[PDB]
Each structure stands twice: as structure tokens, then as C-alpha cells.
């Protein structure tokens, strides 16, 4: 039915993105 949106996949993708970008930024500030 066209009245349904897979919001769970998009939400899951937004959280994985929010996790990867934060850990990458942490690697950015820890130049060793």
C-alpha cells in the first residue's frame, strides 16, 4: 500500500551515520 513508509530503515541509517561520523571526528581530533 502507498500509505506506508519504511521509517525504521531510514531511522536505523540515520543512527549508524550519526555514530560513524562522531567516531571519525574523534579520530580527527586524536591525531596521535
Amino acid at each position: 500500500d502507498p500509505f506506508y513508509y519504511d521509517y525504521e530503515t531510514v531511522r536505523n541509517g540515520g543512527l549508524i551515520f550519526a555514530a560513524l561520523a562522531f567516531i571519525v571526528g574523534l579520530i580527527i581530533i586524536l591525531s596521535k
Binding site: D1, F3, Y4
Partner: protein, 291 residues
């Protein structure tokens, strides 16, 4: 230091005349370009959508269930004697049903007589513009018995034992699906389960359910619901002057001078509900006929 207004060396509000002109000219050019840019992008946005269908329709997944007396708090409080006490209700009922008169639905080129019996759905092709302006099935006031009458300009409604019709939220391409014959305890209803969307009213608790004595439903041919022959909706552009189905509910045995709560819940598979939106699928009303 706050009298920099003017000087004999040319300053106004802080700067000279030639400088005010330069700055004003720059800001006009800057903002004009910004306006043209916002317009160009918003035009691209207008071109990414069609005229016959909204791109996103999931935020209207569960259709609503509204009423005719759009009360300030979904409450119906008036006096069975004072005519001005219930004027705000009747005025809205007459204005709502003003487009349902036999004289309003007179053109045979845009109206089609569906029938006296709720039948299967009527699909008028695809949603494109290859076909002309679709037909809208007629719905005369006579279907809602005891809450229509053949009154004059003012629909003399019910003072005692009032009337409250319900309406299914018009949704484009929405195909109502009534519950299966395997009805999971749906509060005595007629056996016309396949070609009508059921809607049953009730109280809310042990008190409201006892205060409300008898309810009488009225619809197409006498069924408490909406006939499937009027769905789905094809938009306002392709189907202007469309008449969604109506269904009236009258509360005959009411306990006067007592505010009681009524929940008219619409049943079906394609009808969802929500604990945050008391109107998605279901419908609430607080009636109080104080004499």
C-alpha cells in the same frame, strides 16, 4: 555622541548621502538576486510534484472521523428550549449540508447516480489526465433519515434527542476495506459487512455507557456506515464538487442535565488508530442537553 545626525560635512543617520545611495543600491541588487534565486529553486520544487497526486501520503495513513457540529471542545451543550443556545450548531449543519441539496446536484455531466444500495468500489481508471473530469456519485439528504427532513431554509433539527453525523476523511486513492466476516466482537451491526465501512458509537466507561440509552444510526439504505461505491478519491482537480459519504447518529435516550462522553469508533482493516490523535479512526464527543 548621539547627535551624529548631521554635520556640515554631510552625514545622515550616521553616513553621507552618496554612501546611503551606494549601500541601498547594493542591498537592492543583492536582495533582488536572492529573491530570484529562491524563486528559481522553489520553481524547481514545484516542477518535482504532479497535479494529480501528492508525492508523500503516509502521514495520512489512518483516516480521521469528523462531525458536523465542529464544537470548540467537541462538546454539545445547549438548551432544548432556547433557540439561540443551539444556533451555532444548526448554522454549521445547514452550511455543511448546503452542498448536498437536490438542486446542487443537478448537472448530469458531473454527477452519476450510484444507487440505493451500497455496492462495490467504483474505480474510474488511472489518476492521470488522459481521461476527462471524472464523475462524482450523488448522495441525497434523504439517505440520513430523521436527520434531514424536508425543512425550509432552516433545517429544523432535533432539540431533544439531537443528531450528529460523522464523516470519513476524504483521502486521495484511499480504498476502504471493511473488516472480514470474522468480526472480532464488533458491537451488533448489520450483516452488510462487504460493501460498507462500519462505524459504531459507544460511551467511554461504565458511567457514560449507562447514561446513553438508545442510539439510532442512519445511512445509505439504512446501514450504519459509508458505502464503498463512493471511493476512492481522485483529487479536487479531477473531481471537483465531490460528495464524500455521510452517516448520521441520533442519541434518543439521553439523561438530560448530564455531560456524557461518546466514542464513535470506525472499524476496518485500512482504518488505523492512535493513542495521541483521538480522531485517527475513532471520534469523541461530549454531549450535554441541559434543560
Amino acid at each position: 555622541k548621539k547627535f551624529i545626525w548631521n554635520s556640515e560635512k554631510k552625514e545622515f543617520l550616521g553616513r553621507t548621502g552618496g554612501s546611503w545611495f551606494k549601500i541601498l543600491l547594493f542591498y537592492v541588487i543583492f536582495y533582488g538576486c536572492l529573491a530570484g534565486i529562491f524563486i528559481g529553486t522553489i520553481q524547481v520544487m514545484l516542477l518535482t510534484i504532479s497535479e494529480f497526486k501528492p508525492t508523500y501520503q503516509d502521514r495520512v495513513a489512518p483516516p480521521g472521523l469528523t462531525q458536523i457540529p465542529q464544537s470548540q471542545k467537541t462538546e454539545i451543550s445547549f438548551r432544548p428550549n432556547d433557540p439561540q443556545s443551539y444556533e451555532s450548531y444548526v448554522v454549521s449543519i445547514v452550511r455543511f449540508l448546503e452542498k448536498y441539496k437536490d438542486l446542487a446536484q443537478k448537472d448530469d455531466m458531473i454527477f452519476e447516480d450510484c444507487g440505493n444500495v451500497p455496492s462495490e468500489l467504483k474505480e474510474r481508471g488511472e489518476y492521470n489526465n488522459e481521461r476527462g473530469e471524472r464523475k462524482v456519485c450523488r448522495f441525497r439528504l434523504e439517505w440520513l433519515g430523521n436527520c434531514s427532513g424536508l425543512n425550509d431554509e432552516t433545517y429544523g433539527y432535533k432539540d431533544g434527542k439531537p443528531c450528529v453525523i460523522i464523516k470519513l476523511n476524504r483521502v486521495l486513492g484511499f480504498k476502504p476495506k471493511p473488516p472480514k466476516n470474522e468480526s472480532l466482537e464488533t458491537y451488533p451491526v448489520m450483516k452488510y459487512n462487504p460493501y460498507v465501512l462500519p462505524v459504531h458509537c459507544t460511551g467511554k466507561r461504565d458511567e457514560d455507557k449507562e447514561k446513553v440509552g438508545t442510539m439510532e444510526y442512519f445511512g445509505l439504505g439504512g446501514y450504519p456506515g459509508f458505502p464503498l461505491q463512493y471511493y476512492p478519491y481522485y483529487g479536487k482537480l479531477l473531481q471537483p464538487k465531490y460528495l464524500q459519504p455521510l452517516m448520521a447518529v441520533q442519541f434518543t435516550n439521553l439523561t438530560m442535565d448530564t455531560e456524557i462522553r461518546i466514542e464513535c469508533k470506525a472499524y476496518g482493516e485500512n482504518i488505523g488508530y492512535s493513542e495521541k490523535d483521538r480522531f485517527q479512526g475513532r471520534f469523541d464527543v461530549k454531549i450535554e442537553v441541559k434543560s
